[PDB]
């Protein structure tokens, strides 16, 4: 940073533990981990002002896995219109939503 | 003389005994004769939540080699 | 020497209160027992052991763990 | 007798801890075959509920990638009964 | 989710508290904190559902830091009601 | 059924606490040379029930006071009293709170807000100071209360007071820790503003700041709260350092040796209060903030290191 | 589209059996049955999807039912006490029940 | 909700019995010395809550480094403790 | 103070900017914020006076909700990208709430109001320490998320600095006051670079330090906090009436001194930059800087205020010293002028 | 009941518009304590247990305790109604916002490993003694500071 007397000293008490993917307690992976690799060893020698564009599919995919809202938003359509055509009594569930099932 | 603080206390002792011989007897009866599973981890929920669907809805029944 | 006396008979927690702050702080350096604390919370077994791919050249546990080859806790046991 | 009961006390732990370690294989196998088929069982749901809806891909990954992204909670029960969703979600606080 | 966006909105009341004297200088040390609350309970929440557990010392970080600053905050409270009986803010007008 | 086991572990416990104040009431009297109360009913088995019906009758003054404030913290009081005993250990616990030596903790401590409140809301000069006073006392003895409990946990593994049961198979947590023990009953005695520490209500010194103004109905819920505490914060000895013997083949064996040592220490703060003169305030929280408090943290390090130079780290089950 | 598989798939044989049944029978399962479990576990790793690796997952079951399969033939008795001991207790501990273990673990290694 | 059931049932019975009571009958300090404790203990609680983490800590393949960290910890709040008696500041 | 108490506020008050610079962990950063903020309080109130606690009391409340925004905003980002850092896809409020609360740190523009009251009641010495080595800290973290920041913010709270500090310093006649409205200014034109090129807002605060910290230790060592007071200065000790005329002129950007450089070059990078707008206006009232500060010269140095008979007194005993440190920082700071290519 | 953590979030807001409103003194710690509570529920409610308990033991616990002694001593003087008058007014507001989105617990344990040992809330801030050992100790330097800081501004 400002005063980088961590890097000079080798000494790393504050960058092990910066983003999700790293080291996690008892290499319990945190969520996400699949993306955030993906997106930082891509931006990784290539600056950020070139890190914010060609390396954008990556954090397109690594702001869904996190924020997870295009999820929602096609769920909750689904969820509406579902609402709509149990209106007209052509959906209701299924057994395959309630029933008995393998271990 | 002090013989009589007893009574008293007999009454006491009686309703701390209760509680801990009622709770422990509504549970071997609730759970089918044993011991409500305690799940402290997820793993033992897991476990147990399996037994539910292993067999009728409660987790208490048990099925064994013969199934 | 002298008040560490009377500080035995007057003022007798703090003498008492240093003296195990110091304990606690010796024990463990000298113990023939320290080294397994490190070890016996190290072996638990919390998280599953994933296997590795037999590409040759492997000392590893030969498949079955019953195998002689790997670890061994006998020193846990018998400890 | 501290010192000596925890350490027979650990030694029990590993050994129960190891018996998981067992059989987890069998559970690992059962979980991810119960998963597909809740998100499969969704799907023909899925691909009963929005047909009529015009431009509807019957479903898509929310990302781009291809890769196995595990199905969140809500998608797998989401669509299921809502005790099955709720004992998922706040079945462990809840005890027993 | 929208839960983020009450405790977010909750920071912004707290917000609009501490920067809206009301002649109390407790009151306002008391608002102070109804921030590090929220902002404690957002972390944590954030955290949990990201299950960034390495992550976790800083809730509790964010915590003993607030305490202490809390600490400074009240004994310069009680400082100013040795000296003008009150802590009424309007006392505190004189460098003026 | 679950409701019928809310009952027992309620009713009984409410039964039972009636029954101590009786206990009392004679313990105190034979002590001081008198038969105690012994004319209403059979040997005074009556006598609890026939307060409580004067003390709910009597009419309840509301002084000219935050009547909200006046009239919540006596339900708190009853409410956190009742509460704690939920997760308690006897065995099958009607609820394994996985944290709740925390729990304990937690509840104990909201209790001290009763106290505060009452003082303030009450608007009396003796019970402002009373309230003054016993918050002091009251957290400073929760300091090295949670202190205390630190150093056990970390020889038991968890913050589940279940696995004490475990812990304890061989031997009590007297024998080692017995420091903490004594230290545990003091703070116990604090806690409950019983006698050694009851500054809180020294009617001779100060008359009974808490209640100056409280009567009848508000007068018995705290009252009934102190009581049934004085019991819970007993039993948490004798699970915590007593540990009971225990047979999952029998499972009553528990009970009924909890019900022993429970009543015996319960018996010996009765003891202490007709043996002993009160505490000064300085003087109370010296002894917690000077004299004990060192002792509480040194012993904890001593418990730190104990398992790691002894190998003797607990399973965590 | 999301390419899950089929249920005709998926459908495989269950073990279903109590999961007291399986802490007794764990030991030994961990000890008849690891070969096809650890490559299917490498499988599960190295290949992140559960797609990957269903068919092992179908071989990893039936490697086990036979085991029971096994048991049920062969010192079914011994077995049928010690999950019955081990189901009682609340955390199904094993040391509660050692001498309903050692008739177990004895019989099955003098004939399996 | 095994919780909440038995809490509610916990308050209902508090409130019902202030109720009776109610309805039955028809027929300034300078505690600077004080406040000093106080603040100590606002700390002193801080700490305590900063050792609680210890029953998972002492699981640590790291004990060596806990044992230290958690020395260090107890230590120099007791050193505080001590200044506080060293300059008086309690007594 | 017991001095050990002295050293452990003293390294805090130091291990608080350290902390900041060095790490990269913004929570680390905001800690190192935290921590200056709890050494800072307790040497502000040194004398206790009445005075004192007002100063303090609203030093620390400004820099404690201003602490708390920061924060909010690492909080934010964590949701917005795991990382516990600002980065290219921060959201652009994310950022703005930085620089909105970090300017309330540093107290520039329409924050400006704190600072020069705490700068009234805390002494001369802590003075310097509340106006430089408090400085460095927040600034740190602002040159590190630079690339992120808006342009039109930064312009606009710079702007708004110099004219606030030039107009408030006009009026006031407390020394204290002035050289607290000076640095409202002076940290203007360095947030005004920030965006554009960090490096300059290094420079435009080294000569600030350079400049402030002799322009203190010359109104101390006389310990006048009224220009009628440093006016005397002629009988109490004629020498540094000589370097006080030069730095004060050096403060304000008048050619020859050592101070033109930063806005020299400030200027000749936002014109590079195009901002030729912008960086007139700045220039212009920054000539009304000037203007207080060649009144206090007047005063002081070009012509002589009457004095006390009570003065010849101090002038018989003799006069304790200013630091080397004075000389040292008034000559590289009066006339280095000639070797600016290297210092840009 | 999904709404669950949107009522909870809700009841956390109304605390703090009531600390907001500035009451007295000690009105304000109360509501604290009110939302403190309502806090440690919502993140328990995530899972979170020793985080829950830590707000608790210290908010719940000293955090207003202390608050609450100060009070006492410097807050001597008691529009409370009016106040609460505008807490309705917000209330309603509040709900108003909420139903502007109405026209216009679905996912929440948004991701979970079912079978898991040795994961749980503390175990991560466990790591504060091993693979975070900066964290600690600068809030041991906190703490050992702050001990001075208050001693001589008290002083
Ligand atoms: C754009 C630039 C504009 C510049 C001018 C304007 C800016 C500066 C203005 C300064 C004055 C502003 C008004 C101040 C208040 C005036 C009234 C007042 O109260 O004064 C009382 C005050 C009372 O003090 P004092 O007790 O009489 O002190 C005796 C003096 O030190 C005198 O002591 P002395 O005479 O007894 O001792 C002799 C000594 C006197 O020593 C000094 O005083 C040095 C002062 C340096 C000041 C630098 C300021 C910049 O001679 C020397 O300087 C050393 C000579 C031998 C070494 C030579 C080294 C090599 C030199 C090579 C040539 C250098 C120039 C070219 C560069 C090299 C070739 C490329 O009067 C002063 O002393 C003023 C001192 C400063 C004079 C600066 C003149 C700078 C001219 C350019
Ligand atoms: C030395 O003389 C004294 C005593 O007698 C020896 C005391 O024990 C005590 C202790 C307290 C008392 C004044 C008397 C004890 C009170 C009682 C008999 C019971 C109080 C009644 C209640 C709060 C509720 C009773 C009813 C129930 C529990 C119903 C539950 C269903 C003191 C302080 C005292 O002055
Ligand atoms: C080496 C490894 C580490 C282990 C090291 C162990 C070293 C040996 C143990 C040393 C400490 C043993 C005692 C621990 C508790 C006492 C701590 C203490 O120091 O007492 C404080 C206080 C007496 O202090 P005071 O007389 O005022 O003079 C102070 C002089 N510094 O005490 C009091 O005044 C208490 C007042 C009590 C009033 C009520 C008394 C009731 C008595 C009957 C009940 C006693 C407790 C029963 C407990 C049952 C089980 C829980
Ligand atoms: C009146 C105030 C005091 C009320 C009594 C004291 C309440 C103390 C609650 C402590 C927090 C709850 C807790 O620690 O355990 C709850 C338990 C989850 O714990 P755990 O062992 O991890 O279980 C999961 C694995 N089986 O299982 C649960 O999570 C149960 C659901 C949460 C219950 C929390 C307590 C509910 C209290 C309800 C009454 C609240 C009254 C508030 C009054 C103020 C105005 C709103
Ligand atoms: C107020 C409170 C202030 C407290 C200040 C504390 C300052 C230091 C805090 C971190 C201390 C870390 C110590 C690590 C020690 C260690 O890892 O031990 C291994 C090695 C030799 O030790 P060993 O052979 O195990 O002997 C121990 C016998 N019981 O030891 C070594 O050879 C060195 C190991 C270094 C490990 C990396 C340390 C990186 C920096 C950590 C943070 C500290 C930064 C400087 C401050």
Redesign the pocket.
């Known amino acids: 940073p400002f005063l980088d007397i961590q890097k000079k000293l080798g000494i790393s008490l504050d960058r092990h533990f910066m983003f999700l993917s790293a080291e996690q307690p008892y290499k319990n992976a945190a969520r996400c981990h699949a993306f955030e690799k993906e997106w930082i060893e891509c931006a990784h020698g290539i600056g950020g002002t070139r890190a914010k564009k060609e390396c954008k599919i990556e954090f397109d995919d690594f702001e869904e896995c996190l924020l997870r809202y295009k999820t929602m938003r096609r769920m909750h359509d689904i969820k509406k219109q579902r609402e709509k055509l149990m209106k007209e009594g052509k959906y209701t569930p299924p057994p395959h939503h309630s029933g008995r099932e393998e271990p | 003389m002090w013989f009589e603080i007893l009574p008293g206390l007999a009454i006491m002792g009686v309703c701390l005994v209760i509680p801990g011989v009622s709770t422990a007897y509504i549970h071997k009866f609730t759970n089918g004769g044993k011991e409500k599973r305690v799940a402290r981890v997820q793993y033992q929920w897991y476990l147990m939540e399996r037994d539910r669907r292993i067999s009728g809805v409660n987790r208490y029944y048990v099925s064994k080699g013969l199934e | 020497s002298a008040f560490l006396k009377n500080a035995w008979a007057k003022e007798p927690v703090l003498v008492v209160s240093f003296s195990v702050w110091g304990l606690a702080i010796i024990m463990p350096m000298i113990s023939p027992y320290t080294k397994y604390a490190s070890m016996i919370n190290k072996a638990t077994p919390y998280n599953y052991p994933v296997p590795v791919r037999d590409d040759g050249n492997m000392p590893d546990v030969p498949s079955h763990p019953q195998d002689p080859l790997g670890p061994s806790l006998d020193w846990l046991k018998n400890l | 007798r501290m010192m000596r009961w925890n350490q027979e006390r650990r030694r029990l732990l590993i050994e129960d801890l190891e018996a998981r370690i067992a059989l987890m294989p069998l559970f690992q196998a059962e979980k991810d075959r119960r998963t597909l088929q809740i998100l499969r069982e969704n799907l023909e749901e899925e691909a009963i509920i929005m047909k009529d809806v015009p431009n509807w891909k019957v479903g898509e990954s929310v990302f781009h990638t291809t890769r196995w992204v595990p199905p969140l909670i809500g998608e797998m029960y989401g669509l299921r009964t809502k005790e099955e969703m709720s004992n998922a979600n706040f079945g462990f606080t809840w005890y027993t | 989710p929208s839960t983020f966006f009450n405790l977010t909105m909750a920071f912004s009341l707290s917000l609009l508290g501490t920067l809206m004297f009301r002649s109390h200088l407790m009151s306002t040390l008391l608002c102070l904190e109804g921030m590090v609350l929220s902002l404690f309970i957002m972390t944590s929440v954030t955290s949990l559902n990201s299950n960034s557990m390495s992550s976790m010392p800083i809730p509790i970080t964010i915590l003993v830091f607030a305490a202490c600053e809390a600490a400074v905050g009240l004994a310069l409270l009680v400082k100013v009601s040795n000296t003008y009986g009150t802590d009424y803010v309007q006392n505190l007008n004189l460098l003026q | 059924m679950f409701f019928i086991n809310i009952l027992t572990l309620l009713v009984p416990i409410l039964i039972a606490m009636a029954f101590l104040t009786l206990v009392e009431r004679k313990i105190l009297g034979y002590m001081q040379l008198r038969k105690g109360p012994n004319i209403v009913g059979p040997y005074g088995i009556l006598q609890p029930f026939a307060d409580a019906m004067k003390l709910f009758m009597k009419e309840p003054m509301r002084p000219l006071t935050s009547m909200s404030l006046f009239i919540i913290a006596p339900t708190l009081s009853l409410t956190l009293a009742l509460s704690l005993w939920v997760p308690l250990p006897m065995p099958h616990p009607l609820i394994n709170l996985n944290l709740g030596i925390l729990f304990i903790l937690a509840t104990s401590s909201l209790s001290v807000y009763s106290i505060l409140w009452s003082g303030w809301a009450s608007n009396s000069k003796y019970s402002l100071f009373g309230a003054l006073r016993a918050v002091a006392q009251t957290i400073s003895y929760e300091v090295t209360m949670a202190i205390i409990l630190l150093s056990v946990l970390l020889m038991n593994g968890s913050y589940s007071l279940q696995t004490l049961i475990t812990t304890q198979e061989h031997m009590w947590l007297l024998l080692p820790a017995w420091p903490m023990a004594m230290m545990w009953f003091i703070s116990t005695l604090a806690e409950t503003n019983r006698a050694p520490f009851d500054l809180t209500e020294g009617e001779s010194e100060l008359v009974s700041g808490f209640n100056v103004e409280y009567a009848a109905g508000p007068f018995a819920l705290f009252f009934m709260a102190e009581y049934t505490n004085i019991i819970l914060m007993n039993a948490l000895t004798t699970i915590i350092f007593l540990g009971p013997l225990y047979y999952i083949n029998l499972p009553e064996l528990y009970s009924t040796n909890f019900m022993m040592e429970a009543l015996l220490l319960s018996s010996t703060f009765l003891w202490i209060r007709a043996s002993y003169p009160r505490f000064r305030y300085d003087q109370l929280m010296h002894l917690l903030w000077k004299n004990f408090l060192p002792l509480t943290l040194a012993l904890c390090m001593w418990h730190i290191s104990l398992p790691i130079f002894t190998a003797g780290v607990p399973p965590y089950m | 589209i999301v390419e899950l598989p089929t249920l005709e798939e998926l459908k495989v044989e269950e073990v279903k059996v109590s999961s007291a049944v399986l802490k007794a029978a764990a030991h030994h399962y961990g000890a008849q049955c690891d070969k096809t479990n650890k490559e299917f576990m490498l499988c599960r790793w190295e290949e992140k999807d559960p797609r990957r690796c269903l068919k092992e997952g179908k071989l990893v079951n039936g490697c086990a039912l036979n085991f029971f399969r096994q048991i049920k033939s062969h010192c079914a008795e011994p077995f049928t006490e010690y999950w019955t001991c081990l189901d009682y207790s609340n955390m199904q501990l094993f040391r509660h029940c050692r001498q309903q273990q050692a008739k177990f673990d004895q019989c099955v290694l003098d004939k399996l | 909700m095994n919780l909440y059931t038995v809490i509610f049932i916990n308050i209902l019975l508090s409130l019902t019995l202030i109720l009776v009571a109610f309805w039955l009958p028809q027929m300034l300090p300078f505690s600077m010395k004080f406040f000093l404790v106080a603040i100590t203990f606002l700390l002193f609680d801080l700490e305590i809550a900063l050792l609680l983490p210890l029953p998972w800590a002492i699981q640590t393949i790291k004990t060596s480094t806990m044992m230290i960290m958690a020395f260090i910890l107890v230590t120099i709040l007791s050193l505080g403790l001590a200044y506080e008696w060293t300059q008086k500041g309690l007594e | 103070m017991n001095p050990i108490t002295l050293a452990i506020i003293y390294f805090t008050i130091f291990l608080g900017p350290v902390i900041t610079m060095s790490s990269t962990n913004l929570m680390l950063m905001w800690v190192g914020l935290e921590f200056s903020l709890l050494a800072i309080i307790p040497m502000l109130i040194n004398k206790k006076n009445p005075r004192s606690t007002e100063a303090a009391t609203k030093y620390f409340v400004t820099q404690a909700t201003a602490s708390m925004i920061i924060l909010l905003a690492i909080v934010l980002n964590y949701k917005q990208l795991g990382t516990w850092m600002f980065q290219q896809q921060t959201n652009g409020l994310i950022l703005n709430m930085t620089l909105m609360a970090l300017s309330m740190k540093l107290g520039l523009a329409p924050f400006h109001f704190w600072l020069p009251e705490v700068t009234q009641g805390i002494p001369l010495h802590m003075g310097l320490i509340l106006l430089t080595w408090q400085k460095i800290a927040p600034l740190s973290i602002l040159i590190q998320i630079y690339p992120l920041l808006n342009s039109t913010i930064i312009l606009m709270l710079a702007i708004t600095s110099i004219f606030m500090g030039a107009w408030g310093g006009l009026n006031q006649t407390q020394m204290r006051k002035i050289m607290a409205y000076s640095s409202i200014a002076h940290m203007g034109w360095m947030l005004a670079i920030l965006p554009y090129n960090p490096s300059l807002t290094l420079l435009n605060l080294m000569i600030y330090i350079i400049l402030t910290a002799p322009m203190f230790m010359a109104l101390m060592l006389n310990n006048s906090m009224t220009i009628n007071s440093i006016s005397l200065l002629?009988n109490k000790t004629?020498?540094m009436?000589?370097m006080i005329?030069?730095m004060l002129l050096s403060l304000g950007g008048l050619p020859?001194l050592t101070g033109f450089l930063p806005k020299w070059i400030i200027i000749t990078e936002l014109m590079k930059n195009n901002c030729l707008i912008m960086a007139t206006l700045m220039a212009m009232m920054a000539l009304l800087n000037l203007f207080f500060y060649t009144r206090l010269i007047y005063s002081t140095?070009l012509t002589m205020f009457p004095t006390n008979n009570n003065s010849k007194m101090m002038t018989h005993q003799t006069k304790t010293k200013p630091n080397l440190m004075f000389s040292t920082l008034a000559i590289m700071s009066?006339?280095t002028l000639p070797l600016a290519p290297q210092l840009i | 009941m999904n709404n669950y953590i949107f009522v909870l979030s809700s009841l956390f807001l109304v605390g703090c518009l009531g600390l907001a409103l500035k009451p007295s003194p000690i009105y304000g710690g109360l509501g604290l304590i009110v939302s403190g509570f309502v806090g440690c529920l919502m993140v328990l409610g995530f899972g979170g247990s020793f985080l829950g308990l830590m707000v608790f033991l210290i908010y719940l616990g000293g955090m207003l305790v202390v608050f609450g002694y100060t009070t006492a001593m410097a807050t001597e003087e008691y529009s409370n109604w009016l106040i609460l008058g505008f807490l309705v007014l917000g209330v309603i507001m509040e709900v108003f916002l909420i139903c502007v989105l109405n026209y216009y617990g679905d996912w929440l344990m948004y991701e979970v490993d079912d079978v898991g040992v040795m994961l749980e809330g503390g175990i991560g801030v466990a790591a504060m003694y091993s693979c975070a050992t900066w964290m600690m100790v600068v809030a041991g330097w906190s703490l050992f500071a702050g001990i001075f800081i208050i001693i001589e501004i008290t002083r």
């Open positions: 002629w004629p020498a009436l000589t005329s030069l020859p140095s009066t006339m």
